[PDB]
Amino acid sequence: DQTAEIVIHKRIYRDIIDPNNPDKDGYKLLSKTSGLNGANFEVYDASSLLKPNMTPEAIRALVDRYQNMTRKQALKFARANLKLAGQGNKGIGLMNTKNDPTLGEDGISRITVSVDQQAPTKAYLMIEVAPDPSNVDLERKSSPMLVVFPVTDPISGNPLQTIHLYPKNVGYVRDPYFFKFGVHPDGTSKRLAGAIFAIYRIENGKKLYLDMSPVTDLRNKWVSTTDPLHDDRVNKFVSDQDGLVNTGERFLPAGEYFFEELQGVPGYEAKSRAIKIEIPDSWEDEDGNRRFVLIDGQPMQENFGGVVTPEMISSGYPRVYNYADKQ
């Protein structure tokens, strides 16, 4: 008889459950192309979880019950008792997230399921399973999703023919910045404009530089370069009129990195100074205390979302001091 399409949009969000909503309170998407490929779902015919003439409240209670199970608990139930169903891209009831060339979007997986648009008699239980082997740090927080048809479109009054689901994956990133100051031999000092930095990390005893490639998943791309200053692949960060050297839209995950000065400010130019970035792997320690990014060992104030505020700019910290008086 009749079918509907369930479309999973698997994306990655940064922290600071309605699976049908692409907006998530307490979270924000990592980029416009932050879809997550390689995620896998099993989809079960869950019509036997329904009863005839059940109320909307009973359906919501059932949906909530399954959403509040862990994936492993829901799999224990579904694997034992239900059958795979729906035409997925990996098989009956089997979905893998891939790029959608039509929509131009990553993290997409579509499944066609038999539905009853006139009464709630068909339902599908969707549960994420292990991703394709290959982002170990990603928090895959999707829940068991019980999709009960029909889902009526309030605008149109029609049953929805496509259900869009936005299962939540959370990527941990932080946002380094610092201020470059210049110190005159007479003790005067100022914010420095025009310092050109790049970011590198160490891998196998060699430098890899943060490149200009679009972010995919939570991952930045890193390049070996012969000439980071003039290599267009290497992202440069320029100190502005407030002295601010800001990763800006760029973010970094946990680990150790370096801001490398590629062009010093005239008069404040000895191998190229490397300012250490130490990014802890969580916002908070065991006791809920903030864990700071360290810039050359200095704690760096930071807000969720990573935007450097006017108040942070006024503060001008952390600051790295460049001496005009060469000694």
Residues that bind Na ion (CB under 5 A): 143, 175, 247, 251, 298, 306, 317-319
Residue nearer to Na ion on the CB measure, 85 or 215: 215
Question: How far from the centroid of its chain's Cα atoms is residue 79's Cα?
Answer: 30
Residue nearer to Na ion on the CB measure, 171 or 306: 306
Residue nearer to Na ion on the CB measure, 117 or 220: 220
Residue nearer to Na ion on the CB measure, 143 or 169: 143
Residue nearer to Na ion on the CB measure, 4 or 244: 244
Structure tokens at 49: 């979880």
Residue nearer to Na ion on the CB measure, 90 or 250: 250
Structure tokens at 195: 């310092």
The CB-of-43 to Na ion minimum distance in angstroms stands at 17
The CB-of-105 to Na ion minimum distance in angstroms stands at 24
> At a CB cut-off of 8 Å and minimum separation 6, what does 117 contact?
2, 4, 149, 150, 159
CB 163 within 8 A of CB 151: yes
CA atoms within 13 A on the CB side of 304: 13
The CB-of-181 to Na ion minimum distance in angstroms stands at 9
DSSP 179-244: EEEEE-TTS-EEE----EEEEEEEETTEEEEEB-SPPBTTB--EE--S-TTT-TTBPPEE--TT-E
The CB-of-118 to Na ion minimum distance in angstroms stands at 30
Residue 47 DSSP class: G
- Dist CA 188 CA 317 (whole Å): 17
> At a CB cut-off of 8 Å and minimum separation 6, what does 128 contact?
39, 40, 41, 71, 140, 142, 167
Residue nearer to Na ion on the CB measure, 304 or 317: 317
The CB-of-53 to Na ion minimum distance in angstroms stands at 28
The CB-of-67 to Na ion minimum distance in angstroms stands at 5
The CB-of-252 to Na ion minimum distance in angstroms stands at 8
- Dist CA 61 CA 81 (whole Å): 20
